[PDB]
Amino acid sequence: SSKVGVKINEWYKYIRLFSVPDSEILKAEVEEEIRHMKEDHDLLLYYSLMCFRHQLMLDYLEPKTEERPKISDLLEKIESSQTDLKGILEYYFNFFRGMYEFEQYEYLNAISFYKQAERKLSLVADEIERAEFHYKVAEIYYHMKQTHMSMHHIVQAIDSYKAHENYTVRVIQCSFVIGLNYLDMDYPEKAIPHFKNALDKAREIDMSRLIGSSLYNLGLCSFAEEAYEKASEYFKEGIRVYQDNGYEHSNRILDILLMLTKTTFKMRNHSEGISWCAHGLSLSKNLNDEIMAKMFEFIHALYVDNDNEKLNSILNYLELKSMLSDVEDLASDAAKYYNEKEDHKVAVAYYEKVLYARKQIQRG
């Protein structure tokens, strides 16, 4: 078993390097070795965990569109061997499960898993593997708008990654997290260099997904600066990048469509805003993303028919999904809309919701 265990370690190394050809080679090698040794319950779980992690990489690089996804059968195979776990295998189990939960918008489960992984971090001698942990922990803290916690882990990650060679993908992703934390501190001019750096690296390694994401993150800065026409240009080109290189069905394209929709209404192009909102809504429904659909439903209910009962119900829903930053962003949109319309009694209510969300966020 040490021989097969080394191979699975090698496999994981290539996954972290985003070298799909090597990962597939190692995957096929491991499966050949398994078919002969075939006598080790832990080695098999490590195998199923790496299968899991490998698919996570593939789903990020090529999103697959009726059939039970490969990720679900692997997750089932992995959740049957939870008793008597120990050592680094236990760290992997909780870390990989945390990653999966994060991809399903199961934020509380994800922190729960990550925190269990954190306890065994002194078991992880590999500095690059610890960087993976810190990067992924920083990411979820950013999505929870735990800015200081997020920066605390992200700096640890990027130093490790920047100390090695060929972790370019993760270095871009760390630049995303750093920049986005500055944006959450109201420093869009501090965020832009990080995203411009990422965009340049994303173009050098010709990774369309990261190119489209850099343009989106830049569009978010212009939006914050109220440079709405420039934000709109960034959002459109990012959408085009995604749509032209096989990511037209990536759930994360919905973020760019959402912000373009908001942007179009901010420029008072009412009809175009509805058009974008409806396209984003339809795609959300076709990608079976309930959470994204709700956000498109909110913007439409805000700018089109002023359905405040529906706005309130959506804000409550996102809070139950532990997505307080979106509660804050969406309540802020409604507050500012009703303020401009001089419906100040309604604007007050949404400002109170913005204040409530910020307090929930600060409560940690």
Partner: peptide, 6 residues
């Protein structure tokens, strides 16, 4: 909306 963290 949250930025892209990939």
């Amino acid at each position: 909306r949250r930025g892209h963290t990939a």
